[PDB]
Design a protein around this ligand. Structure first.
Ligand code: 88Z
Length: 269
């Protein structure tokens, strides 16, 4: 994992903030390159500093067009920084809502193909995402979609003195396959279930899955056999692909390799 020299980075503008810390737009110096810069909140524990840097090391392993690129880290000075390629259009779910109705079906299917190609790469690396959702897909100015994991599932509001703490990150119920909710059996096939949910987010221009249902209401519906309905102006072939992703038996779900091929074929026809 590349350590970046602080003289090569300038922070220009905060573009997001929370209890993790902040995200900035900045430049990385060759002509300079725009970057996102994620910082660590002041007062982190040694566990948080190690985890923060450990996540950057995980991201640095990947090298794919449809996976957010890590330029490097600043770990030797404060504030510590994770420095990534900049994605002009931000998160996909927000982007689609801002662009409601403004894309052709072919363009939306192209976004899904890019996400699937990133996931196929992750699957071939034996990496299970566990939080595949449009909020974790980033969009650049050319509308290229790239897989990321900011780590929202691993922010914990546990009291530092609590008797009971969350172990192993929280799970996004509306995005998670049934065998992963029940038995914590997370695999690429449970990611494929999540991909089907992303397909529905995309074809609805960012509707919240099951929005009228509580989390328990969602798990009951799925267990009763309910599946998200066909969005208006969703082609039949795309909805069939969604339904295959949502097969109760994980062995019957397509592989990300298959999804990429299926989407490629539709795009050429
Ligand atoms: C808040 O706004 C933005 C945040 C961005 C961003 O943030 C991050 C996302 C993920 C990570 N990931 C990580 O820190 C990690 C990760 O992703 N690991 C990982 C794990 C698995 C995997 F497959 C890939 C990556 C943990 C390391 C780090 C980030 F800093 C990265 C790139 N571009 C961004 C653009 C943003 O707005 C652009 C302007 C949008 N406008 C729209 C219109 O309204 C105004 C705003």
């Amino acid at each position: 994992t590349t350590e970046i020299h602080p003289s090569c980075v300038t922070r220009q503008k905060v573009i997001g903030a929370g209890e993790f810390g902040e995200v900035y737009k900045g430049m990385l110096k060759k002509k300079e390159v725009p970057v996102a810069i994620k910082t660590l909140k002041a007062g982190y524990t040694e566990k948080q500093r190690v985890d923060f840097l450990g996540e950057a090391g995980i991201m640095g392993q990947f090298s794919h067009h449809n996976i957010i690129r890590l330029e490097g880290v600043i770990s030797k000075y404060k504030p510590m920084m994770i420095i990534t390629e900049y994605m002009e259009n931000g998160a996909l779910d927000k982007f689609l809502r801002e662009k409601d109705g403004e894309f052709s079906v072919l363009q939306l299917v192209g976004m899904l193909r890019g996400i699937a190609a990133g996931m196929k790469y992750l699957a071939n690396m034996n990496y299970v995402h566990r939080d595949l959702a449009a909020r974790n897909i980033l969009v650049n100015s050319n509308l290229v979609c790239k897989v990321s994991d900011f780590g929202l599932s691993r922010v914990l509001e546990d009291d530092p003195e609590a008797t009971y703490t969350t172990s192993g990150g929280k799970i996004p119920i509306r995005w998670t396959a049934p065998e992963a909710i029940s038995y914590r059996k997370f695999t690429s096939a449970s990611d494929v279930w999540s991909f089907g949910i992303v397909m529905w987010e995309v074809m609805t221009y960012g509707e919240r899955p099951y929005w009228e249902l509580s989390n328990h209401e969602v798990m009951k519906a799925i267990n009763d056999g309910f599946r998200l309905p066909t969005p208006m102006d969703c082609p039949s072939a795309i909805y069939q692909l969604m339904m295959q992703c949502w097969q109760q038996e994980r062995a019957r779900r397509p592989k990300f390799a298959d999804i990429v091929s299926i989407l490629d074929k539709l795009i050429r026809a």
